Design a protein around this ligand. Structure first.
Ligand SMILES: CCCCCCCCCCCCCCCCCC(=O)OC[C@H](COP(=O)([O-])OCC[N+](C)(C)C)OC(=O)CCCCCCCCCCCCCCCCC
Ligand SMILES: CCCCCCCCCCCCCCCCCC(=O)OC[C@H](COP(=O)(O)OCCN)OC(=O)CCCCCCCCCCCCCCCCC
Ligand SMILES: CCCCCCCCCCCCCCCCCC(=O)OC[C@H](COP(=O)(O)OCCN)OC(=O)CCCCCCCCCCCCCCCCC
Ligand SMILES: CCCCCCCCCCCCCCCCCC(=O)OC[C@H](COP(=O)(O)OCCN)OC(=O)CCCCCCCCCCCCCCCCC
Ligand SMILES: Nc1nc2c(ncn2[C@H]2C[C@H](O)[C@@H](COP(=O)(O)OP(=O)(O)OP(=O)(O)O)O2)c(=O)[nH]1
Ligand SMILES: [Mg+2]
Lengths: 172, 345, 54, 51, 98, 115, 320, 48, 54
């Protein structure tokens, strides 16, 4: 129960490896949905739940529109999942073996202390205010409404200009 | 088009670099870069031809990848120091990734391959907007981190951009590709002088911008795309020829044109910092740049290429040239060498 | 000498070298897959240069 | 400076537009067969659909 | 936390390698771009939560907004590419070399 | 830990149900049975051809509006602020520009399913 | 250029100033068949503006003093010499044909500018959509060559799809012996030396290509001579025509605005007619070109911009 | 009329002419005044 | 003055007297090119003339 975040980070690494290995975009969206859920779990484990749930919802909508588009235009008669080429599977397991090799090397080389096998799960949350109200994530995202109105207005203008941009691109 | 979305898109094109150069937070510099890219894409893909679509796609994926690397550098700096600016004690790996990604944003070699591709297949005014306005925000970020840059990587990128730009402009016959390779060479000069003097790269940027604004304006007047198209300019607009030749010579860096001033003062500063090898190699490849400019001058001004029958109708009709923009910039980009101590800052 | 060998030595050989090198430089196809592969090679070289110079 | 590696190139068009017609949209053929509830038991309505 | 941050940095590196190495699919390239985006979001969120930088907590939301804007623009460009050719192939869009 | 156990119990329940569904009955598999359905005839296409959806602009607008949703969602903590005037003005501006974008798209016929 | 984005924003909408007779009507036919009078009468009793057939001197008449210039300033065509001897050692047939195409392009641009600026309809005689009939007749009679045909097709591809087709295309079918008899009765000695094969070639090009390719985008009003030689039944047909096809229905104020800009900038209209394709029948050369250009600049009213010519007037020279 | 089509500038644009002349006169007057103020301020700050 | 025809696809078609007039006169003018012994010419002239009269 100490290495839970490390297991999640390894799963995120595997999902990003599959996305890099580039299946058919159906399975690419699947891998990105899995990676988004895993990253949500990592953020929730590290702290406030609002950021993880936000990135989960956002990537759910994004990969849904992506699924629609890869059905519409980015498709082929035989969409390769991962086993159309044995090189893709061999490279996936090669990357997994390289990941295990590098983390074993960095555990053996414990001078810097980036990854430690004995010290894993000991330095996840550093210092927390034990007694205290209104210290969770989402209060800062609310402070975007009052303390970073410049961040709020550049995000809003980005979305507004983006509406105009996409209409003019797909005007045809 | 539509005036409302014209106003929105052009205001966002203006707003991107302004936010980048006026914001002290690296995140706000990144959102300014994002503003510039996303705003300029619909202006690129506007004629809806396959070449415009390809150029927009290439530009989008290149700038998106470079901006993602920039954001990686910003997040790693925030992890290392807790601030939102590279102060003094950041990691050299972070700084080198920042420099590499901003070089791919700028388009200097060996990240230069997309720039003539995107500049080709795009209308001339959008090429002007790209090659002048899009290169200020990454240069602003580079000027902001004026120390703590790797001079070795800076000089390697500068020398390869000047070499590849000279060779590419030597090969090309398309005017937009010629302008793009000129952009690559001058960006190489600016990046070369960047870690030693921000004032000199600002000066070279201003000289380059006021030099290639009227070049693009003169291309825009007759919609001249190729060397032959600019060659039949003696029948179309014969008054253009002297200013075209003088601005091409000034882009070549010939004295006593004011385009000699940025190369001269950059060589002076590099002499002050003992980089004679780099300065000499840069000057020789600038001579190569001047060669392809001089071939252009031979085509358009000093000889008279054959013309066709319909240019008689072209002479029958009347034209219109922008006041206060072409002639002013042409004069200030040719005959302003004796104001050199005022130009340097 | 003046019609063959000084001409072959300095100016024509310089022009031949630079036209060969500009053909070799501008021998690119318009494939952004190849362009991005070259960009990856550039990134790897920058990483190696940083790890060597330090 | 055309070489053996670039002798097959062409100059770009003057107006940056070239003919690249395919006409290979391949509209989906779907049959409302004689099992569809919308079909009246016995009908093979072959439909050329664009989505 | 340092092990997790190393894993997230390696995930970003893998998604960058996916972006740089094309496989015939502009949509897959955009997917790699959004994988890079997700990795950066998780890195920023974990850093802010670890350092208790509640004032800097709007930064992941800002990068998510601008990333979705760029994904929107990329999908629109992919639509235009598909209308031009009908296959969405990065090797098929190559005619600007001359 | 509790939520994790409930999630795993539900997943194991669904897996148990589908394993029972697959190992309980009697199997008789042949080609005409497992052919794709297509209303009692052989399919002309491969069902993997491009589909050409007609609401692509609405989908991209949905992406942008979903991120506007993500911006608007911290309002229950935003209303607890000490200023509340800049908060109210900022919320009004955000909702107004979102509505202006929707109105502009409606006027420019963006959400009209161009065939 | 008074008209622009600012004028359109302040309100100069083409759809606001449109009208039920804001139509482009193009009259077509063979060499001598009643189309000059028919277009005149149609414009007269529909309130349109009549544009006669764009000849060699169209730019000369529409620019400057309006008097026709020299035969070297206005092309080098010499239609009389083309009738006297085609297949000449110098390329005169294709020079005449390309110059007539460019002149018709300028005339079509002027007609579109008039219609989009004032709302008044226009009746053109033999617009740019019916000039390839002459080019194909020239090629099939052997008067020009495949290089000339390819150059013409390239210029047509560069210029033609940037404009709008006519609302109505009226055609006057007439047999080749009738055309021959009308030509002989006209009495022009150069025009009497035309080939009946050439006239049949023009008619075949018309029927085979022009009528269907324009019928799929606008309406066609083929008539005989007796249906013509009576310019009132034609006007009644135009009045009770239905305009339910073509690209005139799918466009709005801003498409009209950008078309109006492109059509009021005449150099942008004639830009692609001057592509540097070096066809020896079309290209000139530096010494002759510079001699002709200098002499044209030494013509009265042509040395400077039309606002600035003290030898013909323009008194307020120093304040503009 | 010598010309078949009316030229865009047959009469001076008097608004532009007056604005340009007035801007030139104002700029010269302001330049002379600020030069006088500058020499007066310089002399006042360091003696004569 | 009539609002609708009641048949779908049939336009209201104001001033119908002029339209009927020009259609009937065109029919007569093209019937003048038929042979005099053509029964179609005779009967169609009768029909068109009486409808034009009314
Ligand atoms: C709602 C939640 C619960 C859902 C699951 C249902 C739970 C309750 C199930 C009770 C009945 C369990 C046995 C069902 C067998 C159904 C298939 C069947 O009859 O197969 C006959 C076949 C007969 O096999 P066979 O030897 O005749 O050969 C089959 C091939 N032929 C007939 C062509 C020669 O299999 C069995 O009899 C297997 C019995 C398994 C009993 C397990 C208990
Ligand atoms: C004994 C004394 C020894 C010591 C002195 C040595 C130096 C002497 C001076 C240098 C030699 C003369 C150079 C200039 C003349 C040669 C260039 C030339 O004329 O090239 C012509 C040729 C183009 O021919 P063109 O006319 O276009 O074709 C026919 C019609 N189209 O052009 C081409 O094909 C390309 C020409 C490119 C431009 C050449 C000039 C710039 C040279 C840059 C030098 C860079 C040095 C560093 C190189 C990298 C590091 C090694
Ligand atoms: C390291 C950089 C080089 C990685 C090479 C991966 C395998 C390869 O050659 O991929 C090329 C391929 C090009 O695309 P494709 O359409 O498949 O082309 C087929 C080529 N005829 O491109 C692809 O298939 C995309 C591959 C993306 C891979 C991303 C993840 C990389 C993980 C491994 C990192 C390096 C590990 C090195 C290990 C060495 C041995 C211990
Ligand atoms: C600040 C602005 C935002 C504030 C928040 C409100 C958000 C509203 C977002 C959408 C607004 C769009 C308005 C323009 C538009 O697109 O109207 C389209 C509509 C006709 O479209 P449709 O209904 O699809 O018709 C199909 C063919 N008849 O057009 C119509 O139906 C015409 C409607 C005319 C009247 C509009 C309402 C006036 C209300 C005045 C209230 C004063 C108190
Ligand atoms: N070769 C050539 N001759 C042309 C072209 N256009 C017109 N012409 C010639 C044909 C006639 O000899 C002359 C006058 O053209 P018209 O067809 O208008 O003849 P005209 O005015 O005598 O008769 P009309 O009452 O208008 O039918 O111009 C062209 O594109 N090519
Ligand atoms: Mg006539």
């Amino acid at each position: 129960m100490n290495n839970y975040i490390f297991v999640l980070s390894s799963l995120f690494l595997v999902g990003c490896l599959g996305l890099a290995l580039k299946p058919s975009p159906i399975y690419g969206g699947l891998g990105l949905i899995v990676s988004g859920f895993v990253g949500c779990l990592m953020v929730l484990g590290f702290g406030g739940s609002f950021l993880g749930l936000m990135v989960f919802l956002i990537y759910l909508g994004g990969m849904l529109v992506v699924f629609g588009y890869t059905t519409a235009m980015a498709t082929e008669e035989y969409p390769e999942t991962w086993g159309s080429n044995w090189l893709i599977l061999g490279f996936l397991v090669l990357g997994v073996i390289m990941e295990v090799f590098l983390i074993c090397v960095l555990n053996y080389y414990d001078e810097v202390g980036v990854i430690n096998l004995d010290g894993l799960g000991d330095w996840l949350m550093y210092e927390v205010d034990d007694v205290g109200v209104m210290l969770e994530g989402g209060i800062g995202v609310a402070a975007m409404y009052s303390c970073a109105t410049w961040m709020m207005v550049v995000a809003g203008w980005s979305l507004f200009a983006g509406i105009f941009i996409i209409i003019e691109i797909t005007r045809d | 088009m539509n005036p409302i979305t014209l106003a929105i898109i052009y205001f966002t094109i203006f707003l991107g670099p302004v936010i980048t150069m006026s914001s002290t937070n690296l995140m706000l510099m990144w959102v300014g870069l994002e503003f510039s890219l996303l705003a300029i894409i619909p202006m690129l893909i506007n004629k809806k031809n396959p070449r415009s679509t390809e150029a927009a796609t290439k530009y989008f994926v290149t700038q998106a990848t470079a901006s993602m690397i920039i954001l990686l550098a910003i997040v790693l700096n925030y992890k290392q120091l807790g601030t939102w600016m590279f102060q003094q004690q950041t990691n050299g790996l972070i700084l080198n990734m920042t420099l590499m990604a901003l070089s791919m944003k700028l388009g200097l070699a060996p990240f230069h391959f997309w720039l003539p591709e995107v500049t080709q297949g795009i209308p001339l005014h959008m090429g002007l907007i790209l090659l002048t306005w899009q290169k200020i925000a990454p240069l602003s970020i580079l000027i902001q981190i004026y120390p703590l840059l790797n001079s070795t990587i800076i000089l390697m990128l500068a020398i390869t951009s000047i070499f590849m730009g000279a060779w590419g402009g030597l090969n090309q016959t398309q005017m937009r590709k010629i302008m793009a390779y000129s952009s690559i060479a001058h960006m190489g000069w600016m990046l070369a002088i960047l870690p030693y003097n921000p004032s000199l790269t600002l000066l070279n940027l201003m000289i380059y911008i006021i030099l290639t604004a009227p070049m693009f304006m003169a291309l825009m007047l007759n919609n001249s795309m190729t060397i032959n198209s600019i060659s039949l300019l003696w029948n179309k607009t014969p008054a253009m020829l002297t200013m075209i030749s003088l601005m091409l010579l000034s882009l070549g860096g010939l004295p006593p044109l004011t385009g000699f001033l940025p190369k001269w003062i950059i060589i002076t500063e590099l002499m002050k910092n003992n980089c004679l090898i780099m300065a000499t190699l840069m000057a020789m490849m600038a001579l190569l740049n001047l060669f392809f400019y001089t071939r252009l001058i031979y085509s358009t001004s000093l000889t008279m290429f054959p013309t066709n029958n319909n240019s008689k109708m072209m002479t029958h009709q009347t034209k219109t040239k922008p006041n206060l923009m072409f002639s002013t910039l042409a004069i200030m980009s040719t005959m302003t060498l004796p104001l050199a101590p005022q130009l340097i800052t | 000498l003046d019609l063959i060998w000084l001409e072959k030595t300095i100016p024509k050989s310089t022009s031949t070298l630079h036209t060969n090198m500009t053909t070799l430089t501008t021998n690119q196809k318009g494939l952004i897959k190849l362009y991005f592969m070259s960009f990856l090679i550039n990134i790897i070289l920058i990483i190696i240069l940083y790890s060597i110079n330090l | 400076y055309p070489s053996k590696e670039t002798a097959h190139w062409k100059p770009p068009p003057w107006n940056d537009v070239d003919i690249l017609k395919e006409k290979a949209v391949t509209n989906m053929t779907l049959n409302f067969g004689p099992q569809h509830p919308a079909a009246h038991g016995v009908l093979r309505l072959v439909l050329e659909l664009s989505g | 936390m340092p092990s997790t941050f190393f894993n997230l940095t390696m995930a970003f590196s893998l998604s960058l390698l996916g972006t740089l190495m094309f496989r015939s699919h502009l949509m897959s390239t955009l997917l790699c771009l959004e994988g890079m985006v997700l990795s950066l979001f998780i890195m920023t969120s974990v850093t802010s939560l670890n350092s208790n930088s509640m004032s800097s907590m709007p930064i992941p939301i800002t990068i998510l907004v601008f990333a979705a804007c760029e994904a929107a623009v990329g999908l629109a460009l992919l639509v235009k590419v598909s209308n031009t050719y009908g296959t969405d192939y990065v090797q098929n869009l190559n005619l600007l070399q001359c | 830990m509790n939520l994790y156990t409930v999630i795993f119990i539900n997943i194991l329940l669904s897996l148990t149900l589908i394993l029972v569904a697959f190992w309980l009955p009697q199997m008789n598999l042949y080609s005409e049975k497992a052919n794709p359905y297509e209303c009692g005839f052989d399919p002309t296409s491969s069902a993997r051809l491009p589909f050409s959806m007609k609401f692509f602009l609405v989908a991209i607008t949905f992406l942008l509006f979903d991120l506007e949703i993500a911006l608007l969602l911290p309002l229950p903590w935003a209303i607890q602020t000490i200023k509340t005037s800049t908060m109210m003005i900022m919320a009004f501006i955000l909702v107004t520009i979102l509505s202006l974008g929707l109105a502009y798209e409606w006027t420019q016929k963006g959400l009209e399913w161009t065939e | 250029l008074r008209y622009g984005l600012l004028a359109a924003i302040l309100g100069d909408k083409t759809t606001k100033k449109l009208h039920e007779y804001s139509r482009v009507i193009t009259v077509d036919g063979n060499i001598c068949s009643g189309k000059n009078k028919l277009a005149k009468e149609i414009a007269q009793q529909l309130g349109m503006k009549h544009y006669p057939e764009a000849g060699i001197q169209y730019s000369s008449t529409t620019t400057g003093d309006g008097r026709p210039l020299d035969i070297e300033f206005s092309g080098s065509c010499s239609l009389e010499k083309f009738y006297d001897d085609p297949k000449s050692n110098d390329g005169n047939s294709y020079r005449l044909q390309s110059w007539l195409y460019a002149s018709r392009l300028l005339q079509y641009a002027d007609a579109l500018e008039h219609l989009l600026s004032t709302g008044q309809g226009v009746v053109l005689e033999r617009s740019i959509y019916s000039d390839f009939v002459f080019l194909e007749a020239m090629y099939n009679q052997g008067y020009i060559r495949k290089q000339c045909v390819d150059h013409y097709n390239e210029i047509k591809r560069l210029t033609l799809p940037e404009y709008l087709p006519p609302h109505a295309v009226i055609y006057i079918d007439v047999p080749v012996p009738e055309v021959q008899s009308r030509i002989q009765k006209k009495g022009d000695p150069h025009e009497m030396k035309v080939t009946s094969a050439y006239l049949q070639d023009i008619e075949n090009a018309y029927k085979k290509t022009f009528l269907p390719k324009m019928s799929e985008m606008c309406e066609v009003l083929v008539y005989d001579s007796w249906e013509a030689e009576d310019p009132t039944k034609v006007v009644e047909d135009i009045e009770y025509l239905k305009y339910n096809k073509g690209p005139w229905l799918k466009q709005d104020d801003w498409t009209f605005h950008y078309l109006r800009m492109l059509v009021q900038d005449k150099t942008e209209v004639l830009n692609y007619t001057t592509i540097p394709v070096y066809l020896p029948e079309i290209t000139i050369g530096a010494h002759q070109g510079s001699r002709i250009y200098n002499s044209f600049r030494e013509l009265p009213g042509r040395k400077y911009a039309p606002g600035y010519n003290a030898e013909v007037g323009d008194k307020w020279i120093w304040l503009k | 009329k010598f010309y078949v089509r009316e030229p865009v500038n047959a009469k001076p644009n008097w608004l532009a002419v007056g604005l340009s002349v007035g801007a030139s006169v104002f700029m010269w007057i302001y330049l002379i005044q600020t030069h006088n103020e500058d020499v007066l301020e310089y002399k006042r700050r360091n003696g004569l | 003055l009539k609002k609708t025809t009641g048949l779908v696809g049939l336009a209201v078609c104001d001033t119908p007297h002029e339209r009927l007039t020009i259609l009937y006169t065109k029919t007569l003018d093209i019937l003048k090119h038929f042979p005099k012994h053509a029964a179609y010419r005779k009967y169609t002239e009768q029909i068109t003339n009486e409808k034009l009269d009314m």
